[PDB]
Design a protein around this ligand. Sequence first.
Ligand code: CA
Ligand code: CA
Lengths: 306, 302
Amino acid sequence: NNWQDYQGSSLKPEDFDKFWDEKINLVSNHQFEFELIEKNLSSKVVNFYHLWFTAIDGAKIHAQLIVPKNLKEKYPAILQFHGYHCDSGDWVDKIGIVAEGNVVLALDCRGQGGLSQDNIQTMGMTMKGLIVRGIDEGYENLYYVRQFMDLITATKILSEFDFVDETNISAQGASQGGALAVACAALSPLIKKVTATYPFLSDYRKAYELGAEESAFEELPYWFQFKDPLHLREDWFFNQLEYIDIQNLAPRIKAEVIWILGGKDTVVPPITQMAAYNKIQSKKSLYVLPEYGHEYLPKISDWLRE
Amino acid sequence: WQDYQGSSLKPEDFDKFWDEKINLVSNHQFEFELIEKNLSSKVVNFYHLWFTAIDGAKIHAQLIVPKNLKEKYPAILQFHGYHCDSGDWVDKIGIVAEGNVVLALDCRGQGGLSQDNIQTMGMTMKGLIVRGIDEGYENLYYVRQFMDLITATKILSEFDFVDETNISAQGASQGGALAVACAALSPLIKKVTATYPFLSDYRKAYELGAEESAFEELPYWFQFKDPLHLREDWFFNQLEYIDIQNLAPRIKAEVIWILGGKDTVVPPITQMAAYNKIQSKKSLYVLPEYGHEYLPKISDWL
Ligand SMILES: [Ca+2]
Ligand SMILES: [Ca+2]
């Protein structure tokens, strides 16, 4: 019941919206060069393509493109994002949803398990963690600033396909993928639907307050342990992360939201995700599996088919 | 433990590769700068030492000097552990008060002030052993980190108040590995005191199951970049160039090797791959009840 009343712990800066408005404009006015190279996997109902484009910062970004065989008609499209450390997953995992008449764009995050390039440069700590990668040069140099812009760029390219129904584009993902799906719908309001599973990257100040050494937010106490153990720049540190806290993007969402989480999740605490969910103002639904944690959630996928 | 020969597959080009890097540093005039540290002491002065490496990165070190300077002093290069920095300035007051010069080097991008400028198309999430491995061993993080050791030794020896004939190196874990590597790439070093050195016997460290050790990056890379082990041979062939057991034979300094018997962070078997290949005067000290932690009593004993 209190999850409704949790307003979050963020300190949204006045300049937040101007920053992201400018980034949206930059993507819209940029003509992106991309390339499609078919991957050799034999199927009777689907074709597979490597999608390579150059981001606004020069980095080479990779995505999985999975399309039906008949391309003479337009299909609804689904943007799918993956979890921390992982990649876009097995190609065959997309055969079912595209066989129903959909186009899937599975984006690879920069410098993780996939093929996308990380080109963040910094004078500070590069040992571990991608939330704080580049934090010394300010929020403008944060890794997720470019990672969020890849979502807008992927949506732009996906929307301009002659076989993609631009009116029915949706986003889905788990953990980090849930955060990126939420950010993708907020930064590209054309998105019609979002299905986010225990989204990450939310309420950094609260995630630190809970004690994050065993959570997915462990890089935050790690940074203080080795970069600022006396907490001399605590305010400055969390002020940079405000620009990549998805709860600050949540109000801008116009898509329908389906939110799924596990009640025993200690990797991504439910309280930090509710900071973002409570600030969604469009149509939203919240589904909980009490006995499950940061893991595969059964049955819920059949429930939503209805 | 004496007869363990290591698991390395030393590449044909290994010595030719590192000989060129030593020559490159030896023939290069490095630009450095000294900036006063505000720490107040009656027996020592503290200085920020900033130099630019041959690759452009800005490298930082702590320089701690006695108050007098008209005569030469023995010098000590000191290196730190994984994730850490050069430590508190006051930790060096005692050793410098005895008439020594301490250069405490900060590793690149590891919590200290030194810059990491490795660029790669591959995984940047975690780990500095495998940082830049996709572009080959030339782009490995520790190739430039090892050259910083040679460069730091170069600058330290060229001070008019440093007795270049009595330069030694010390460190623990990563610092122990860098201390060992420092002696191999600069044989002028007279003494090495290495405490449970890291960065040795990568193939064996993986074979033991490294998920709970300091080598966890190696299974991590396979877990997310190559789960079917399609490039296992290529992976460990790149790491040969930064395995200190391959550098150990060229060491001429006397070596003091200290380790803890219960160490699961850096298993002793990987350390012995490097220690057994040292051919100069060497001694081995073991604390059976201690692990990867502070080792008492041994400092007084020496
Ligand atoms: Ca592939
Ligand atoms: Ca300082």
